[PDB]
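User: These chains co-purify. Model them together.
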Amino acid sequence: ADALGMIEVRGFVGMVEAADAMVKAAKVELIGYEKTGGGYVTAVVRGDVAAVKAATEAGQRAAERVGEVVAVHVIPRPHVNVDAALPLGRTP
Amino acid sequence: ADALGMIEVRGFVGMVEAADAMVKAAKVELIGYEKTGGGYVTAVVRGDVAAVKAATEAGQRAAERVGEVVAVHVIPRPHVNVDAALPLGRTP
Amino acid sequence: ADALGMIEVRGFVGMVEAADAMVKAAKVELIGYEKTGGGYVTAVVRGDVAAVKAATEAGQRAAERVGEVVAVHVIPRPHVNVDAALPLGRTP
Amino acid sequence: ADALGMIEVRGFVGMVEAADAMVKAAKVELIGYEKTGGGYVTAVVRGDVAAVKAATEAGQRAAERVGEVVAVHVIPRPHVNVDAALPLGRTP
Amino acid sequence: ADALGMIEVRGFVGMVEAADAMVKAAKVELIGYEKTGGGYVTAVVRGDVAAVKAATEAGQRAAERVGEVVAVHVIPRPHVNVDAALPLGRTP
Amino acid sequence: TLRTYIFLDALQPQLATFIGKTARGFLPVPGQASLWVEIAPGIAINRVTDAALKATKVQPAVQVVERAYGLLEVHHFDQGEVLAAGSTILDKLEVREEGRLKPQVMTHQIIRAVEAYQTQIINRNSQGMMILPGESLFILETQPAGYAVLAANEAEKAANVHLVNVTPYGAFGRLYLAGSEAEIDAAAEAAEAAIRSVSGVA
Amino acid sequence: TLRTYIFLDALQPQLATFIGKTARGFLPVPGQASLWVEIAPGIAINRVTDAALKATKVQPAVQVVERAYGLLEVHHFDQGEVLAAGSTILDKLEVREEGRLKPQVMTHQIIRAVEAYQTQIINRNSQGMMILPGESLFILETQPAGYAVLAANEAEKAANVHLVNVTPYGAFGRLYLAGSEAEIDAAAEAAEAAIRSVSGVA
Amino acid sequence: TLRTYIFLDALQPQLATFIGKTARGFLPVPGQASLWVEIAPGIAINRVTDAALKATKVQPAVQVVERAYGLLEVHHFDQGEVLAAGSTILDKLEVREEGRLKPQVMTHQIIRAVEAYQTQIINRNSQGMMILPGESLFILETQPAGYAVLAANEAEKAANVHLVNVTPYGAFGRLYLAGSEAEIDAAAEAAEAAIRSVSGV
Amino acid sequence: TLRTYIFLDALQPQLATFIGKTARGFLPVPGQASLWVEIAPGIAINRVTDAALKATKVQPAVQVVERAYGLLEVHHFDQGEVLAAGSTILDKLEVREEGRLKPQVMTHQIIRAVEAYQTQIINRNSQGMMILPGESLFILETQPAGYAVLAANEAEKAANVHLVNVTPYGAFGRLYLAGSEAEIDAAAEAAEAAIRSVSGVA
Amino acid sequence: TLRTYIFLDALQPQLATFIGKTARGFLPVPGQASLWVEIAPGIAINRVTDAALKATKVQPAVQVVERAYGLLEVHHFDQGEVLAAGSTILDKLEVREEGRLKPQVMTHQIIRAVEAYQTQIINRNSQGMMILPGESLFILETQPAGYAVLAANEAEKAANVHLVNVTPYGAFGRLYLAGSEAEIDAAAEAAEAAIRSVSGVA
Amino acid sequence: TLRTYIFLDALQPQLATFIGKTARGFLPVPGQASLWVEIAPGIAINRVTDAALKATKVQPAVQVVERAYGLLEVHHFDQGEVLAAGSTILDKLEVREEGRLKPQVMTHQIIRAVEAYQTQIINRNSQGMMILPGESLFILETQPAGYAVLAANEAEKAANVHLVNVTPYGAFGRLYLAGSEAEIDAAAEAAEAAIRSVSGVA
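Assistant: Joint model of the eleven components:
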């Protein structure tokens, strides 16, 4: 449906400063956070591609001052099998 | 609305000493802690910005004696979408 | 209304690879195709301006590999006479 | 009757940027577009003589950037046989 | 309770410049002064935590110019036994 | 000659309120994305404004023709529209993102516990929120004058302060801020950290 | 013709700040005792002000002579000095304490959750603190106009509100306030209880 | 207490230009339908404006609170949206269409061949297009003041005139128009007919 | 509806200077004759001005269209041109010489040895020559407002005073004068004796 | 130090009307000759004005004591009188006709079909005639500021345009015109041909 | 950094009256000591003002934060308090008495018998006492702008003149005096001798 934005930080503190700087920078929807174990947490924001591209680049710009930022990526179109299989806030 | 401060110590012992110095140094509220796996826990205090700026600089100093301090950050104004989507104490 | 994205390829194969890469890379809408004769065909996607700017430059890079790309252009706001004269998908 | 303005571009995309820049740079009416085959399309604007002289010289400068301009011409008063026979937008 | 700011200057003149620049640089209350003999006097300001941290750092910078500053310290929250035994102006 | 190109990703409420109070144009509402362009000379900004308006859906508020400089502010809800207007403005000038002047923080100060005798002068010489006596004050000058709105935006976005005045047009960009001590110190840290991360020509 | 005679025991900080922003004269500081005298016609207030300044050591701030009416503010730290100036003002007019007109609350509305479009107009047409979109709004007209500063003083005394605009002169005395729901509710309760406890001539 | 309720189906170009030059708010563009509401007292117009903005998507341009009265303009491209805002305004005041006062025409003059010594004073104290010396002048006062923009709209709509100044608020609603002789005569005919085609009290 | 019609035989220097400072039009110089016509409503003064300018070679200075009323001054060096313009104004209004209202002297005070705290307010609220602390003060309101310039002319003609402020339009015609004791007393005598010598409709 | 000497042969009406709107002095009427002198520093222009007024019968409209420069306009019906005042002004400064700075055209541009969001900004910051959407716009800057009235006079003299705004004083002289496309192109050609036919010292 | 430091040991009445008319902070009365500091940059004067107000009991009147030439006035009854405020100001900047710029008298002229056509311009563009036709005029500029109040104070102290306009802030510091011939010659001698009796670094 909507576009997709992700910051993955080894550490909970850097993910929150990521997840705080994203929802201030644009009109996005912080839907949750995925705990894959081992200290990795992934903030998932969601909205149109104008917002979540200019939000996660402000998420990465703030989370590189407190945490070891693992991976930053924007998916403008998650495919319809992705949103039904992976927990990305749009489970039908 | 309240300010946000965090101590992330690799280890449960260094976090409790972090979460004991913060509630004794200033008037904060230890709302809980977050277990993100891999040996990481994160003490989360939440009061006005004058106290969590002075508590988390004393919770950091007491936690460096016993544990491994990873990430320390203070958020003066966490956004209202952060508090509803992350377990940071003020979920409506 | 919506912004206008256009790929023109001399060849029906390189237009389909252009038109398939555009609708997969951003939330756009392939409204049709314009056969101006002589071998020129033109794929037209039409959505909001941040998507159609990312769709065409991802649809050009797919079309330059398989065919001859004639023209690539993004109009952020087309005039009301353009959508009321040209078959661009928003005829009132 | 009304003055006549034309851009002919080898390519549909270069016509639409011309046909958009003409209806923004003055008060002209884009009556339509003439597909004469072989990849030659032609935008036909038609307003008064002060505007279509200024629209087409701003419509040529936008169509040389992305398209391949064949010919640009302004007719201040086309004859009544021209409008009655050719598809120029003032057919009685 | 109320935070606790203290300047100790070897000399009464260096303390009065300290005790006057502290009550001018924030909203604090000079509760008194403690003569511990030997020439040491100690100005005790007592406000909230954000004020006495900004008072004593402008009381220290004012008293180093006129006297020899022995020690400067700010307590954000003194315990209830500290105020009950020591002469800090808030003894019930 | 480009002097300031800054893109505000979202207008904070007191910044949007001050721009609506002191703007000569179509006022912004909070939550909108904004874009500031300042060039010299101060009459080519009409050509810059016309290019941006014929390209996109954006809507101008602050177009000030100064003594020698020229400022432009366009804004819209869609950040793609605002960045497309920025692409059009930078294409019309035939420069790039980094042709702008690097901002110079000339004098930044925190004037904690302002006495009332100074507050009456400051609030008589300001359009934004009033300053109460006994509160901290954060003054700030930047050259060029366009980055003072970036400083005010990030300073409101980080901590909770009162916006007293921001001066986007002129030879030097002035910014006043008021509030308690810790909040002014956090907003001052935010404003100083936000101005110094702007790449351009020194 | 004595229209308004009210004695403020202590100016609140935002009221003192607004009077210092919009006065023509010597500006007051917070904590000072004040005194508002509004008479008719508008030029006898020069004689009233002269008598007050020959009697006491008080210091005038606001002396506005509008289309028909005249207003006077005097202020000093000492309540005895300000009441002595008030006694001299009442003796020069040779009127009583209750020669003032009764303050008529014409309209008191709490406009809840003000949209952005209305806040832009309210903040553009105000001198005091800015109003932000999403806050409440308390409007209040009084006749005669000199009781609006009394309403502002008491509504700030018993709440935590913004002072957007108060108009102590003219045909009717307007008052704008801003804040949350409960703060504006407490301010409205305090102002309506304070204006109704003022006697006079109906 | 309603004093003026007039709907405009379309703002003419010079009228929209003058309102954007002299407004305090969100400026209008030509083609937008308008709505002028003037009431008594002057501070209930904040509540009327709030009701209109909670109802519809309109933009307010001119909200002037003068010495005793208060004015509201709202505008949007959709006449249905502007009339829905007007219906919400009429429901909030709990009045009808005919609760407005009837516009009295105080003084309408057509001054022929205005000399330079008068034009300098007229357009030193104007806010719109300059009147040149030798051009004619149409003046008008309509009480209540909110019908002056109706007069200006329907006068520009039927002629080729200058809109020198129109005062939509205050005790009286003033209107200045300039141009050639026959065009000012046509604009005067249209404005007087459009004001006298308005009912009320 | 005629309210005021007065023919000044000669403008005194400070009166001509104040009218040239505060006028919107062709300014008057000393020695010229003046003609103050105040009518109701405020917009028929355009027709009055046009009739006077088509008749004579006079030169207009002040044409204020205030909230309800309207004013006109025309001036020329020759007295006959201004008198013929006055005859044309009286023929266009179709009224007599006595259609003007008789001026009502509302309040005349000689405020002696004014304290500094009041003089600062008065000279902040002035455009003429400044009042100094330790001088006298003559205040004067007239109804209708167009006779205040008659009062100012006849008060400057018979004394050595400062014309602090005169207001020829609006609700009432205010007048401020400053000088010594005897000079302000003689100017007060002249103004009170010259305003009362004007007949009309009571 | 002479920066601009220019002699308008006859004031065209829109230029005369804008000067009468924005002049601080005795207004001009159309058909009068005019003389613009700009010097630096801007307080020797009082000496220049006094010399011109003691010599001839001219009458001033615009004398601007600017931030750093100084402007003077004198006008009279007789072109011999206006040129005699010009000869006196040039005798007082001990310079000649060609001691002026030659005007540098810095930014001239014809903006065609100005969109309605920009027209509101242009006419809000203009005193002269308003601009309508769809009309063209002619912007212009010349240094020094004194030649903008020459540009406005010649551009009105050739074509049938509207003078939106002309700024004859400041660091840079700005000119705004508006009309149809052919008429703005004719006025642009005339103003550009008029500014560069001015001999001077670059 | 420091451009102007002058200590006015007693404010003469017309200078005090002009400052009370055109000031920003608390108004002075005559008989008070006064002290003027002008620094560059302009926003750093909010630190100087706070240092002086936290040291002494003095009060501010003028604090203009004009583009790059910010100015400060302080004043009190006690010359000890005013000199202690000045000592605090100079010890904050780590400069002395003679770090200031020595003033450059750029243009000083006496215009004899100013005509009416020039006086209407002079007093349309002035706030102080009006000038009358036939009187003199003392035009004066000093760089920096802060010494214009010294040039006004000494010239009023040593002659019986009028103060027409004094501009202590901006690029150049202007001064307009007016009176009879011998009195303007005495005031010119006093002001020109007082400005060049100031130690500084040119």
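Residues 136 and 181 of chain I are 6 Å apart (CA to CA).
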